[PDB]
Design a protein around this ligand. Structure first.
Ligand code: FMN
Ligand code: FMN
Ligand code: ADP
Ligand code: ADP
Ligand code: SF4
Ligand code: SF4
Lengths: 652, 689
């Protein structure tokens, strides 16, 4: 390990504790929370193995009078909640990390749909959520504030019993009661908790003092904030968690910061900017990031691509995925691990057909298991859809999905890669490899079928119609000045907006038509949706919402208002159709059709994975490839579940 | 009576239902998370006299599931203890116990399990939220597996104690609908094409299940009565041919609408009995009994459906939530005591927000296990004797009703001459008349009580309250719509030129505006995002105004997506000529115009108008409470032991929060201090070892 990285492995004090290094996994959600607690705990345990010196839970609701159901985070309302949390703290500490819990009172962000308590805030206003929920908060009175302090102390004591070394008060992102007292928008009080900055930070100071009094002898208190608050409270917590100028200059307390390169980390510390390197998503993509820097294996780091698929798992309450790391939140469920494969079985040879994200991850994971792997790719480029999409506006970071796998595979002696090999069933049978994985991808459809239409729509064949594949292959003229292009987006994730930007940059007049109330609808779950709308408007794109396309005509499209059914035409010179995709499965069907020749050929099994099985986002393809590698040679489970799961404990 | 027909027994396969009252499968916002709450709620239906009681849909396989929605699961043996608690509760009082089994098919994205979704034909998944995944087409072995998975679930269901299994195929949802519909089933093998092929899957599953458990278990099929997808929807006419062709397939036909939006008809858009046309005649096609729904709250409608041969069973979901004792009250000749469903669909919002459902009419719904509440029994009076309830809105009325049933001497003081507060005013607005049943139920119930005195024209002051010497006071004094534009977009007052005419919903409800607005343009600024804005726009339109509705949301009446009213509201407003401006706030009200902002870009533009109908948010009427708190030192001499504030006067919210708050007050009076303990029970996850 190069000496410029040694500073990252110096110990750092946090209140009564010492962290073994500067790698600090900040609180982050995972889609399991209080529903899937053994999954969350084991995931935290993998961070412990990975070398993180500090590990935090997601936010934990510390009282039944404020909660944000349907979101699933953690709860610490009663003694019942301690065992699940104790399992998490235990896992954090096995390999030397400090165990942290984040406590939250959502305040004016919590409608209390589950508990049905009256919501409480500094001032009486409508609740503030993503979804315009139809309830208001009551203004806290003085006795409420005393209770709220007591409730935080109660949760701190339970946190000690649950085995946590650090408590973080969630006061960032405009979320929670600490932000609400600090903000003059939400805190319009005129008593001693409002008005002056000293009054607006009184609650925060009273909570911290009360917690220090109760457990400060064994437990550190951190404050996470998103700045005169500094001069006045420089030494209030044991640690400032920033989600700088004065905190560094006025406070004797350590600081952690986040910001999605070991050289940058070391410089931030060397230059006196940070004491701790805070990470959420980089630790999800690579839980062993600290360990790989410690051992000088910087070339083996799996980089976050910033797709925010992990966030969609919290927004859909469904256990988060990571595009780069398919083992994320599958450690307890399936025994998967980001740096260890299960032992090789009895078979020896595998053919992987197609070098997209699915085939690439299958190849990487199988070779690490010990199989001899041949990867056949029909074109002269690795990466499949990622090699093509990475060239589109705003998607270049996704190339790390290929580059990581290309690099890892290049280091393996048990992998051979063939380009220009569009395999037939005859080819595959001739090779006599024992197991075949068909990862042959998919194509965007030309017949308009997706959601609005389930059978081909009326299309005049004189209209120019491009799919995203045509655009990626540069079928369209480089210069579209003078032309109007309707982008029909019945996909509702990212491709429609990306295609509209390609057309915009080519000089077209661009009209984006989507049946949804939102452009790039599902990117609401990645929190990107607002910025996408603004970029398209800045590009001059004309956004037509709540509007389907019922027919493509000679010089126009017919459209429908999705509520009323009323129809109207939009003139255009071409239609860029972003409908849905059809699996490329002919080769698989050809091999299944000749299943009888397999034994003679030496083929034991043929499976179809990734987009060739069922089109989905890229993270589903890396997942399917990893799953194929994990399941090869494992025994039949019949009708058993391939994952563990916990259910509700019946009260007696 | 004409109602005797409703209590005749009816055979369902090997079982006999003791009467014709049939609780169709319905969700509750608890499901697999809060199974003891769901179980106890089913037990109350048993007490109430239902002859058949069903669970909500239960996912019978891990390769198809609809997370984040929380229904039930039957994937493993682990799942059986919770279901057995439900079937046990169903049967205590003689109901048959039914479980509904579902395979969501092209509707199930598998976000939780990460299995590949499966469907008859390969298409994008079809959900509310445009999820970015597609289903793979079932192959023959998949179909054999799926049948086996249904058999496995049927066997687990028998072990869990259920008498009936319902195969879920309604609301356009699930694999049985998907095989029947030519839109979703484009196969060319023997499971596609002809109606006979498209119903092959159903025949094979039913046969397989009967073979396994048919000696002790009846099978019902819940069917979509109509579907529209281009020209390929499974039409009501086609449904009729399916039934005729398969007349002896299930033990019972459970008939429901082809979308949830259509089936759980809001009272604002659908009258009672709305599915009769879709259903009439079907009974003639099969010799198996038929259940249907229609927001049945009128016993006369119920008896007619059976007498005129439309239905064998009166199916109820929401009427049984609002009044779980509806069958017993008809049996005992207390029709006047029925708590009628108002068709607000607040119960559905609990499923859509995964949060345990409320009922506007029945605040005890899904609080039976959590808090010991019961729709027809109050806890016994404690040691105190007198209670003053100030305000006769939904909150004060429910507190009064429930307190009198505990035995307290209750005085109810109301400032106006009318009972009902906001409901007495809102019930007169377009489409909200059925919501008036919230007042009428409570008004009637209180009129039968000898321990309640009601004072009108009595706007109480704190001095009045101290003078009366009642032991406990509940301040239920409501709220007012704000005139300063504050809600969500603005948290402090917006710029408002005082020369512009600005009406709030209170003004409109008081007829402050001219009855005839022909020739005038009215901007409705909706920053409330539930129902009032759209209702106000309809009032203005009906008065003849040119109406422009401006809202910062991407949807008109945004939160009514959770009540399933949203689409019909948009269509109604468009039909009325309302000009709907979405994704647009109001930044200022000027002399003859409002300034608006595109919420994404910030770009500003003005809209001319003669008046602004401001639908912002509400401010609690809490002066009286504050005055009394300020004089807390005088309470002991005055004899006052406690003063609490409830309902909109505490924190404005929908009407159901107010009936909830009143009931909660009545339930908690004189109860022991719990300290920092929870006032409700709750279950947590069972840790695996
Ligand atoms: C949820 C998830 C899934 C992620 C990616 C972010 C997130 C999540 N939950 C959080 C929580 O419960 N409490 C909290 O304080 N912050 C939470 N975050 C934000 C996260 O801590 C980081 O601040 C951001 O992810 C940015 O840092 P980085 O990811 O670039 O390293
Ligand atoms: C949930 C809820 C909250 C309601 C009101 C209806 C609903 C819900 N869950 C259902 C389920 O899980 N399976 C099923 O088949 N139907 C479900 N429904 C619909 C309900 O069964 C009724 O069909 C409608 O509500 C109409 O009947 P009614 O309420 O007018 O009597
Ligand atoms: N018959 C074939 N033989 C070899 N490679 C193929 C064949 N058919 C398609 N391919 C390749 O398979 C890959 C499919 O990858 P992609 O579309 O990204 O799928 P996924 O997202 O499922 O990984 C492409 O790189 C494509 O060139
Ligand atoms: N000082 C008072 N004394 C008696 N009644 C009052 C007083 N102030 C307001 N009210 C009444 O209280 C009721 C409030 O009802 P409402 O606004 O519907 O509240 P909620 O929805 O909380 O029940 C109204 O009927 C109103 O006339
Ligand atoms: S899902 Fe995407 S953004 Fe989140 S950690 Fe993985 S690669 Fe990074
Ligand atoms: S919430 Fe409304 S619609 Fe649902 S059962 Fe109760 S009164 Fe009926």
């Amino acid at each position: 390990r190069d000496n410029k990285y040694d500073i990252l492995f110096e110990p750092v004090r946090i209140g009564p504790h010492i962290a073994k290094n500067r790698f600090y996994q900040v609180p982050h959600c995972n889609g399991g929370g209080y529903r899937d607690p053994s999954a969350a705990a084991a995931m935290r345990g993998i961070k412990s193995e990975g070398g993180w010196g500090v590990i935090f839970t997601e936010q934990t609701e510390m009282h039944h009078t404020s909660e944000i159901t349907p979101f699933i985070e953690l709860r610490l309302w009663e003694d019942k909640d301690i065992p699940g949390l104790r399992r998490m703290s235990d896992a954090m500490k096995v390999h030397g990390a400090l165990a942290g819990i984040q406590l939250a009172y959502s305040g004016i962000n919590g409608p209390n749909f589950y508990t049905k308590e009256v919501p409480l805030a500094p001032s009486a206003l409508p609740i503030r959520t993503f979804t315009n929920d139809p309830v208001q908060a009551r203004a806290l009175d003085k006795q409420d504030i005393k209770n709220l302090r007591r409730w935080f102390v109660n949760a701190a004591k339970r946190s000690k019993i649950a085995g946590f070394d650090l408590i973080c008060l969630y006061g960032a992102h405009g979320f929670g009661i600490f932000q609400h007292f600090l903000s003059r928008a939400t805190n319009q009080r005129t008593d001693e908790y409002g008005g002056s900055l000293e009054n607006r930070s009184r609650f925060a100071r009273e909570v911290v003092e009360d917690i220090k009094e109760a457990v400060g002898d064994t437990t550190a208190i951190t404050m996470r904030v998103s700045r005169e608050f500094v001069e006045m409270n420089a030494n209030l917590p044991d640690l400032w968690d920033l989600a700088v100028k004065g905190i560094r200059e006025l406070s004797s307390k350590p600081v952690v910061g986040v910001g999605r390169s070991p050289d940058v980390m070391a410089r931030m510390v060397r230059q006196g900017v940070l004491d701790f390197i805070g990470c959420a998503r980089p630790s999800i993509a690579d839980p062993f990031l600290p360990k790989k820097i410690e051992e000088g294996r910087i070339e083996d780091i799996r980089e976050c691509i910033g797709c925010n698929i992990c966030i969609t798992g919290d927004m859909t309450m469904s256990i988060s995925r990571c595009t780069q790391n398919p083992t994320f939140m599958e450690e307890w469920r399936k025994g998967w691990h980001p740096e260890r494969m299960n032992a090789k079985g009895d078979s020896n040879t595998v053919l992987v057909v197609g070098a997209g994200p699915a085939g690439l991850e299958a190849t990487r994971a199988l070779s690490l298991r010990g199989y001899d792997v041949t990867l056949a790719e029909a074109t002269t480029t690795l990466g499949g859809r990622v090699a093509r999409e990475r060239l589109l506006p705003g998607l270049s970071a996704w190339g790390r999905v290929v580059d990581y796998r290309q690099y890892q595979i290049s280091q393996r002696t048990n992998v051979e890669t063939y380009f220009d090999s569009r395999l037939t069933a005859e080819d595959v049978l001739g090779f006599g490899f024992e197991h075949v994985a068909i990862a042959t991808g998919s194509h965007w459809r030309r017949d308009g079928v997706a959601r609005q239409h389930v059978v081909p729509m009326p299309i005049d064949p004189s209209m120019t119609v491009w799919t995203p594949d045509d655009i990626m292959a540069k079928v369209h003229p480089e210069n579209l000045s003078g032309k109007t292009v309707v982008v029909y987006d019945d996909d509702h994730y990212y491709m429609g907006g990306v295609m509209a930007e390609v057309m915009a940059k080519a000089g077209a007049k661009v009209i984006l038509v989507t049946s949804s109330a939102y452009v790039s609808d599902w990117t609401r779950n990645t929190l990107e949706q607002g910025a996408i709308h603004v970029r398209l408007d800045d590009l001059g794109v004309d956004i037509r919402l709540n509007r389907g396309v019922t027919a493509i005509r000679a010089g126009e499209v017919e459209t429908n208002c999705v509520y009323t059914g009323k129809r109207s035409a939009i003139g255009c010179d071409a239609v860029l159709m972003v409908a849905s995709r059809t699996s490329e499965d002919q080769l698989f069907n050809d091999l299944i059709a000749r299943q009888g020749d397999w034994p003679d050929a030496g083929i034991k099994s043929v499976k179809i994975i990734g987009d060739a099985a069922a089109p989905a986002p890229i993270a589903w393809a890396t997942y399917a490839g990893h799953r194929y590698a994990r399941e090869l040679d494992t025994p039949d489970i019949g009708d058993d579940l391939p994952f563990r799961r916990e259910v509700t404990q019946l009260e007696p």
